[PDB]
PDB file of N, CA and C in Angstrom:
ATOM      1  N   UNK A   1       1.665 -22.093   3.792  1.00  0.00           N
ATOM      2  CA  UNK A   1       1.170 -20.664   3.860  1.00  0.00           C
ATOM      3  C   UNK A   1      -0.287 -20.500   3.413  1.00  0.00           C
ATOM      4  N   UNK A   2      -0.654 -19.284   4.328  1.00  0.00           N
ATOM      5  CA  UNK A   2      -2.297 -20.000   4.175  1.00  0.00           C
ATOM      6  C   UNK A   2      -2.938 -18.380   2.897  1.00  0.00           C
ATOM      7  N   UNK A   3      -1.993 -17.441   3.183  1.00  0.00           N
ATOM      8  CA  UNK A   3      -1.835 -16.249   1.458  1.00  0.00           C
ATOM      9  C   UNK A   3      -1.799 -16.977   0.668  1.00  0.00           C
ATOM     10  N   UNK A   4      -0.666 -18.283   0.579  1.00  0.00           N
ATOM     11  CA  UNK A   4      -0.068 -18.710  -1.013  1.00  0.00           C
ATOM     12  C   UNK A   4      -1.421 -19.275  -1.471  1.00  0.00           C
ATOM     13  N   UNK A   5      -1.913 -20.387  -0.560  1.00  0.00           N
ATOM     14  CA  UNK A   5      -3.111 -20.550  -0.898  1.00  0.00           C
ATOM     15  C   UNK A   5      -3.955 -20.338  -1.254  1.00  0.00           C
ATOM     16  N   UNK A   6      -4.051 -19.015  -0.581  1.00  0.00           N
ATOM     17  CA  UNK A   6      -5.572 -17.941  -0.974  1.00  0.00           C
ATOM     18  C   UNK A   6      -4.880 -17.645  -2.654  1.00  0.00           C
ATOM     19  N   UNK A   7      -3.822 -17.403  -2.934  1.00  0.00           N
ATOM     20  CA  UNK A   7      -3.740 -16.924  -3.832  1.00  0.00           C
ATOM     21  C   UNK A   7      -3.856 -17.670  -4.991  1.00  0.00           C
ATOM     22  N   UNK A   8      -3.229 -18.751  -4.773  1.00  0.00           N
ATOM     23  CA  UNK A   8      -3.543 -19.925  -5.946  1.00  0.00           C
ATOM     24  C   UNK A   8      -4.654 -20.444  -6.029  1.00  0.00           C
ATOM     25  N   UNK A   9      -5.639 -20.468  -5.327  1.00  0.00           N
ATOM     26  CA  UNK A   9      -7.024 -20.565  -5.484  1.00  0.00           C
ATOM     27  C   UNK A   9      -7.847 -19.345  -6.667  1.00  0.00           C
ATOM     28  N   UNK A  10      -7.174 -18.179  -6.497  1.00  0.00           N
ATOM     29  CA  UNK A  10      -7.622 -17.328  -7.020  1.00  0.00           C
ATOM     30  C   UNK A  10      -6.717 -17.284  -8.676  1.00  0.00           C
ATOM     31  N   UNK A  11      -5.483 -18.014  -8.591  1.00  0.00           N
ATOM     32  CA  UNK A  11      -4.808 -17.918 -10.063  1.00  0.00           C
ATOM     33  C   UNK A  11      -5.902 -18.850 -10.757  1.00  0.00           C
ATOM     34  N   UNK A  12      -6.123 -20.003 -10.366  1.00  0.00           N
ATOM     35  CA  UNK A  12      -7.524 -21.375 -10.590  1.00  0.00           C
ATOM     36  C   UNK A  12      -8.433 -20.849 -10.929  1.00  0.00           C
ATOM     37  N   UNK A  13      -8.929 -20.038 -10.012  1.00  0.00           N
ATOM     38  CA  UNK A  13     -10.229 -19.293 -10.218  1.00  0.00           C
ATOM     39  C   UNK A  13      -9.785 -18.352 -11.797  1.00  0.00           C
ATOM     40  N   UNK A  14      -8.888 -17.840 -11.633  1.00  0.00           N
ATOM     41  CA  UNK A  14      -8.388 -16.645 -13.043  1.00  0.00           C
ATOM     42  C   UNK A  14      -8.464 -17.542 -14.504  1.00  0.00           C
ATOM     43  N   UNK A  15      -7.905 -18.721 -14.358  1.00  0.00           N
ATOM     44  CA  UNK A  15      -7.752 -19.583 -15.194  1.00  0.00           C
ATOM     45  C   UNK A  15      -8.543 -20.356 -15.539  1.00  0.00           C
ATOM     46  N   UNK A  16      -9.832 -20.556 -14.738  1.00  0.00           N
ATOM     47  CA  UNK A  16     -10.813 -21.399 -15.033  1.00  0.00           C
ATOM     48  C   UNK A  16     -12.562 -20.033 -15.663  1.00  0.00           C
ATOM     49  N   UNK A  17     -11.495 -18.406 -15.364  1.00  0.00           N
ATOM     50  CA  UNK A  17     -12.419 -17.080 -15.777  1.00  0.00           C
ATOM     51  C   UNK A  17     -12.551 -16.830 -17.483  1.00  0.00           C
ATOM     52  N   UNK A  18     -10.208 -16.844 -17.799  1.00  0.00           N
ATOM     53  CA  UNK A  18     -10.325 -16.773 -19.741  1.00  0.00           C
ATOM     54  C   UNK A  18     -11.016 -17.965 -19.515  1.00  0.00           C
ATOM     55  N   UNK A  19     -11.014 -19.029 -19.588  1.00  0.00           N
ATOM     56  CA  UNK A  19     -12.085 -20.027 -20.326  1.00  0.00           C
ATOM     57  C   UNK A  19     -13.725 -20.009 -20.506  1.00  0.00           C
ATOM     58  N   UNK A  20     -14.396 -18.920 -19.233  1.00  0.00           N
ATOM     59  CA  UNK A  20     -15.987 -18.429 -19.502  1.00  0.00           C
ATOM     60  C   UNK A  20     -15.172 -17.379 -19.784  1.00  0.00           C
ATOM     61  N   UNK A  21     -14.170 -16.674 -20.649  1.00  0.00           N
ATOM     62  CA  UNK A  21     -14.657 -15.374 -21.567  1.00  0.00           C
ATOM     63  C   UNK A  21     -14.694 -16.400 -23.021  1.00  0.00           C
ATOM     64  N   UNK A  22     -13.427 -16.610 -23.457  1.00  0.00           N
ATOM     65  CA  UNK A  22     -13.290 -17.229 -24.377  1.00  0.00           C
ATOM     66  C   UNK A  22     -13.810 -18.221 -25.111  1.00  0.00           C
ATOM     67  N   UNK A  23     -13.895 -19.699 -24.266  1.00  0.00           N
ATOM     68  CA  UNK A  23     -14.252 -20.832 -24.937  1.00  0.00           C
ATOM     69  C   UNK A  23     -15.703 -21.759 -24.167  1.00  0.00           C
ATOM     70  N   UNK A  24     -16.077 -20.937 -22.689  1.00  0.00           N
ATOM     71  CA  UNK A  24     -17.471 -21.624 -22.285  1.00  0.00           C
ATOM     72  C   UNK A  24     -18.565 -21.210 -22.662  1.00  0.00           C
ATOM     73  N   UNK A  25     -24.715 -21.968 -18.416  1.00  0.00           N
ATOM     74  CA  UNK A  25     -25.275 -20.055 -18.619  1.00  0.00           C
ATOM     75  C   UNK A  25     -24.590 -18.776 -18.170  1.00  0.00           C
ATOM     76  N   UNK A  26     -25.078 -17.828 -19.044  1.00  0.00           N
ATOM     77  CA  UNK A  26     -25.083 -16.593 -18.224  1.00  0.00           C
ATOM     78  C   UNK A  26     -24.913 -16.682 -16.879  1.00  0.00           C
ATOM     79  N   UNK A  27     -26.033 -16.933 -16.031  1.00  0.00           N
ATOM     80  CA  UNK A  27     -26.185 -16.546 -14.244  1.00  0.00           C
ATOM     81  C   UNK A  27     -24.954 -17.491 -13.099  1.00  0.00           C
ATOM     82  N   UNK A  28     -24.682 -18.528 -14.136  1.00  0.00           N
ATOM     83  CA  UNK A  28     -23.208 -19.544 -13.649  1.00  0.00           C
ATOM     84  C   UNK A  28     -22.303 -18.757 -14.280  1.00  0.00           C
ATOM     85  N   UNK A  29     -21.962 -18.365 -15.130  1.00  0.00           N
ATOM     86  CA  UNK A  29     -20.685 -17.876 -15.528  1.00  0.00           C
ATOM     87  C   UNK A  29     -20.171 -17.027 -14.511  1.00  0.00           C
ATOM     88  N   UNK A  30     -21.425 -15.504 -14.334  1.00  0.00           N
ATOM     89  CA  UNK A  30     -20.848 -15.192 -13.623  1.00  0.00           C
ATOM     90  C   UNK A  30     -20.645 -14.697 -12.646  1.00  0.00           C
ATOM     91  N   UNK A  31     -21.671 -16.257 -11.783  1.00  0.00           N
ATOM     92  CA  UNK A  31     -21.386 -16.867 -10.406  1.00  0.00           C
ATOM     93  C   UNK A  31     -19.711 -17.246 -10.355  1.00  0.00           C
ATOM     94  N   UNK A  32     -19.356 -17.527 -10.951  1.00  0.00           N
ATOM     95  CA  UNK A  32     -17.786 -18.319 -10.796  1.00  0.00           C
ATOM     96  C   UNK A  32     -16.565 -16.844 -10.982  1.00  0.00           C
ATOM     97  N   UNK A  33     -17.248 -15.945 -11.835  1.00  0.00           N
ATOM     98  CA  UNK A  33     -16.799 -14.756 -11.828  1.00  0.00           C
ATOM     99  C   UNK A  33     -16.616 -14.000 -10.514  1.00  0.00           C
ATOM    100  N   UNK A  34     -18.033 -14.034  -9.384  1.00  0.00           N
ATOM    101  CA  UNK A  34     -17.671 -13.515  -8.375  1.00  0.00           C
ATOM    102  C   UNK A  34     -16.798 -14.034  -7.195  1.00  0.00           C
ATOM    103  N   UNK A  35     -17.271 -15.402  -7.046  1.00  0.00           N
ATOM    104  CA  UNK A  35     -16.416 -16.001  -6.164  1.00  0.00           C
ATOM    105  C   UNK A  35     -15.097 -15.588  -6.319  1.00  0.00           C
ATOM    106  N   UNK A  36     -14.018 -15.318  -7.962  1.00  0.00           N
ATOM    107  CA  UNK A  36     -13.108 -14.967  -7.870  1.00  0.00           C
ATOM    108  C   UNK A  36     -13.011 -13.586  -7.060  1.00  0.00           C
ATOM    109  N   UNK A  37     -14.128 -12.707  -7.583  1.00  0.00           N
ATOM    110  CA  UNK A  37     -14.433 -11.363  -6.697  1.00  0.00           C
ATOM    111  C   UNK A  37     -14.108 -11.882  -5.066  1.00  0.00           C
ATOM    112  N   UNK A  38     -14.814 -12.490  -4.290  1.00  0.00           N
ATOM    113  CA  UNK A  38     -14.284 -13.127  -3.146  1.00  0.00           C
ATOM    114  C   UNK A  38     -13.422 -13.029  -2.403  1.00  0.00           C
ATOM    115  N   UNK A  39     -12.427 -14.189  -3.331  1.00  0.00           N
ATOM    116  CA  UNK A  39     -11.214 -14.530  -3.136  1.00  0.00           C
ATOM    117  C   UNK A  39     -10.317 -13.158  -3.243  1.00  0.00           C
ATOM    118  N   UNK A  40     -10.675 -12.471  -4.258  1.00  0.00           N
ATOM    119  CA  UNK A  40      -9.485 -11.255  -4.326  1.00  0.00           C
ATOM    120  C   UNK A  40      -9.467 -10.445  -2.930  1.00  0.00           C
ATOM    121  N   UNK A  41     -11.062 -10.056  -2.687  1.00  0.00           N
ATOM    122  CA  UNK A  41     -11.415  -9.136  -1.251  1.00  0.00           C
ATOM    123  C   UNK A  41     -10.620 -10.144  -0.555  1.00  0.00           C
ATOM    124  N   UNK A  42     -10.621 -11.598  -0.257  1.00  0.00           N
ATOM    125  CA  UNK A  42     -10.195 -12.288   0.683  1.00  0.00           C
ATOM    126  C   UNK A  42      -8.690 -12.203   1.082  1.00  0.00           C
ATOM    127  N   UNK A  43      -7.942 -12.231   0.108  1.00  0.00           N
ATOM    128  CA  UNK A  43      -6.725 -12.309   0.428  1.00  0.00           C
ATOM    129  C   UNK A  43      -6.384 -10.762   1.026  1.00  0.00           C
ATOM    130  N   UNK A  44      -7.037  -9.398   0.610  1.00  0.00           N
ATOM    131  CA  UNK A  44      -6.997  -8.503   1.547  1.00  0.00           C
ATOM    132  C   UNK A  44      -7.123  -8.555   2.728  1.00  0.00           C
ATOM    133  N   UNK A  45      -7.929  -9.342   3.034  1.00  0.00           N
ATOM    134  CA  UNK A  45      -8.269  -8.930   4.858  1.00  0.00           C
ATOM    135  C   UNK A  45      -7.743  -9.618   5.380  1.00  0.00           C
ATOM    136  N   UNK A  46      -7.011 -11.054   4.713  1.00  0.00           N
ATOM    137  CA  UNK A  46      -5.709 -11.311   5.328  1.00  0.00           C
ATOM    138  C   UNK A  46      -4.603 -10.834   6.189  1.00  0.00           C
ATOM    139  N   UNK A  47      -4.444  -9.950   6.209  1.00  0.00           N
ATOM    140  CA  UNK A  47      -3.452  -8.781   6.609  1.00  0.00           C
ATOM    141  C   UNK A  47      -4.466  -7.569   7.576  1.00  0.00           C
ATOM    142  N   UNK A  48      -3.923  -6.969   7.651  1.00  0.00           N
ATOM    143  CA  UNK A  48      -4.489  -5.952   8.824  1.00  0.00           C
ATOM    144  C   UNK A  48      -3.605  -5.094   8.898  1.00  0.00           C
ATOM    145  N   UNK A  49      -4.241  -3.906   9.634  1.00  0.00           N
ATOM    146  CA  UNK A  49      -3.787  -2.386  10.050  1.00  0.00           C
ATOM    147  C   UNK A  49      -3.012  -3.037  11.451  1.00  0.00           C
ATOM    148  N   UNK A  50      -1.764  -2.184  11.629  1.00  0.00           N
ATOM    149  CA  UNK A  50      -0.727  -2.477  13.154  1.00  0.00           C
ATOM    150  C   UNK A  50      -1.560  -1.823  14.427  1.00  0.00           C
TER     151      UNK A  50
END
Protein backbone atom coordinates (compact mmCIF):
# COMPACT_ATOMS: atom_id res chain seq x y z
CA UNK A 1 0.00 0.00 0.00
CA UNK A 2 1.37 3.02 -1.25
CA UNK A 3 -0.92 5.42 2.01
CA UNK A 4 0.71 2.89 4.50
CA UNK A 5 3.81 4.04 3.18
CA UNK A 6 3.24 7.57 2.90
CA UNK A 7 2.30 7.23 6.30
CA UNK A 8 5.12 5.51 7.89
CA UNK A 9 7.45 7.70 6.30
CA UNK A 10 5.79 10.42 8.05
CA UNK A 11 5.57 8.34 11.68
CA UNK A 12 9.92 8.32 10.83
CA UNK A 13 9.75 11.64 9.96
CA UNK A 14 7.55 12.32 13.58
CA UNK A 15 10.09 10.30 15.36
CA UNK A 16 13.17 11.48 14.00
CA UNK A 17 11.02 15.53 14.86
CA UNK A 18 10.81 14.70 19.27
CA UNK A 19 14.47 14.09 18.79
CA UNK A 20 15.22 17.95 17.07
CA UNK A 21 12.76 19.16 19.87
CA UNK A 22 14.26 17.37 22.65
CA UNK A 23 17.73 15.92 22.34
CA UNK A 24 19.35 17.49 18.75
CA UNK A 25 21.47 23.90 13.16
CA UNK A 26 18.60 25.87 13.36
CA UNK A 27 17.97 26.15 9.29
CA UNK A 28 18.38 21.91 9.19
CA UNK A 29 16.25 21.30 11.98
CA UNK A 30 13.71 22.83 10.54
CA UNK A 31 14.30 21.72 7.10
CA UNK A 32 13.49 18.11 8.35
CA UNK A 33 10.52 19.75 10.16
CA UNK A 34 9.01 20.69 6.83
CA UNK A 35 9.52 17.84 4.76
CA UNK A 36 7.37 16.21 7.53
CA UNK A 37 5.01 19.32 6.56
CA UNK A 38 5.18 17.57 3.00
CA UNK A 39 4.51 14.34 3.72
CA UNK A 40 1.39 15.26 5.86
CA UNK A 41 -0.07 17.61 2.70
CA UNK A 42 1.04 14.41 0.78
CA UNK A 43 -0.83 11.79 2.07
CA UNK A 44 -3.93 14.22 1.51
CA UNK A 45 -3.89 14.43 -2.05
CA UNK A 46 -3.68 10.91 -2.07
CA UNK A 47 -7.28 10.59 -2.21
CA UNK A 48 -9.53 12.83 -4.18
CA UNK A 49 -13.03 14.36 -4.58
CA UNK A 50 -15.65 11.51 -6.58
Amino acid sequence: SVWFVSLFIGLMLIGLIWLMVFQLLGPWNYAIAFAFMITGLLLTMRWHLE
